[PDB]
Amino acid sequence: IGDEPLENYLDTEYFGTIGIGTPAQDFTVIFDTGSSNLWVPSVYCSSLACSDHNQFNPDDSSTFEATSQELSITYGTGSMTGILGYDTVQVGGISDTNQIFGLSETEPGSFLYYAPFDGILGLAYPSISASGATPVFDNLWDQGLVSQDLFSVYLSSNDDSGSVVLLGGIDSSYYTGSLNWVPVSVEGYWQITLDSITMDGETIACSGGCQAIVDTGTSLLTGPTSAIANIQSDIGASENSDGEMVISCSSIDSLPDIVFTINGVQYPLSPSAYILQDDSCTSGFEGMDVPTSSGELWILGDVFIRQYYTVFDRANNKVGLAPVA
Numbered sequence: 001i002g003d004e005p006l007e008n009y010l011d012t013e014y015f016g017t018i019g020i021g022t023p024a025q026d027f028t029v030i031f032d033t034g035s036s037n038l039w040v041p042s043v044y045c046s047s048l049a050c051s052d053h054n055q056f057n058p059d060d061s062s063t064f065e066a067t068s069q070e071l072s073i074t075y076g077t078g079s080m081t082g083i084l085g086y087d088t089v090q091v092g093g094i095s096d097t098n099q100i101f102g103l104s105e106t107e108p109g110s111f112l113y114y115a116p117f118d119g120i121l122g123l124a125y126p127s128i129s130a131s132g133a134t135p136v137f138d139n140l141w142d143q144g145l146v147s148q149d150l151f152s153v154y155l156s157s158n159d160d161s162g163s164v165v166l167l168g169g170i171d172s173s174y175y176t177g178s179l180n181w182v183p184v185s186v187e188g189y190w191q192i193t194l195d196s197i198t199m200d201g202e203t204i205a206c207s208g209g210c211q212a213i214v215d216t217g218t219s220l221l222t223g224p225t226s227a228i229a230n231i232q233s234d235i236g237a238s239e240n241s242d243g244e245m246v247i248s249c250s251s252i253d254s255l256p257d258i259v260f261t262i263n264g265v266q267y268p269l270s271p272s273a274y275i276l277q278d279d280s281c282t283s284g285f286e287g288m289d290v291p292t293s294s295g296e297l298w299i300l301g302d303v304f305i306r307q308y309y310t311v312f313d314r315a316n317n318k319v320g321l322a323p324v325a
């Protein structure tokens with residue numbers, strides 16, 4: 001069982017350190033259940049985001065083996081291109097040998113320049129991995145470095161320490177009640193069916209069901225822009241001068257919980273979860289249109305995951321949820 005501590009950066013990004021190569025070169029990576037590639041910046045990249053983050057240097061690793069396979073990824077925010085290569089990755093106390101990973105060669109755009117983390121470690125299914133690169137957790141399972149084909153995620157609140165990815169384990173110290181298991185609707189993302197979104201008894205979105213993914217790499221609770229717009233009004237949010245959804249800090253005490261029904265079980269989010277507070281109070285919701293085969297995706301990001309300990313089970317292709325302790 002491997003324990004990977006995560007730093008909680010402003011309740012918006014959760015990243016942990018990994019080592020790559022021999023000797024180990026260290027990187028912070030987002031542990032991202034919404035993607036499936038591992039990549040870090042490399043010395044081959046001249047982009048500005050590469051210049052203000054750690055860069056992997058193959059020349060200094062005795063176990064590195066190059067490939068001539070290239071890689072390209074577009075995320076909802078930014079993007080990268082690079083090279084695949086093989087090396088030993090240290091993650092959660094586990095020596096993940098012969099792990100294929102991306103060495104960036106371009107990292108355009110503002111966001112990655114200002115992000116505190118170097119790269120991304122995806123935890124989703126191999127079917128959505130760019131250039132078919134074996135995801136890290138698949139490589140762990142295939143080498144037998146975890147005994148149970150599952151991992152769990154605890155994300156702390158209020159910028160506290162203690163966030164953790166548990167590789168190969170479930171820890172009931174981190175939740176209360178029993179774990180509720182949700183079948184994966186479509187194996188790619190950790191994609192599940194959301195039955196309803198309600199408020200004060202009344203359905204306010206996702207009437208008749210909608211597809212959703214559980215995504216540690218997304219800060220907010222996002223959905224189709226239209227549906228999100230109604231929710232933004234139902235809680236009393238509106239764009240400011242400079243483009244942010246302001247909610248009175250007065251309403252954290254007044255409004256009722258918003259309830260997500262998943263596989264017939266109710267998962268409430270209180271105003272203290274879906275209203276981001278700092279004097280300054282913003283909406284935890286944000287519009288973002290994610291079109292796919294199965295339909296337009298909702299994103300249950302860190303706003304939701306902070307309230308529910310989450311188990312990602314590849315043995316039986318299910319997601320487990322329980323209220324955090």
Ligand SMILES: CC(C)c1nc(CN(C)C(=O)N[C@H](C(=O)N[C@@H](Cc2ccccc2)C[C@H](O)[C@H](Cc2ccccc2)NC(=O)OCc2cncs2)C(C)C)cs1
Binds near residue numbers: 115218299
């Ligand atoms: C400044 C402060 C307030 C904030 N920082 C943030 C951090 N941001 C921007 C995000 O969380 N933004 C999310 C995001 O892209 N998360 C990303 C991590 C990331 C962050 C920054 C730069 C590069 C990558 C990672 C997320 O798991 C997204 C979720 C997703 C899935 C499918 C389609 C679209 C989106 N995953 C992907 O984009 O997967 C890439 C793929 C494309 N094809 C197959 S997988 C968006 C979905 C909104 C939010 S608020």
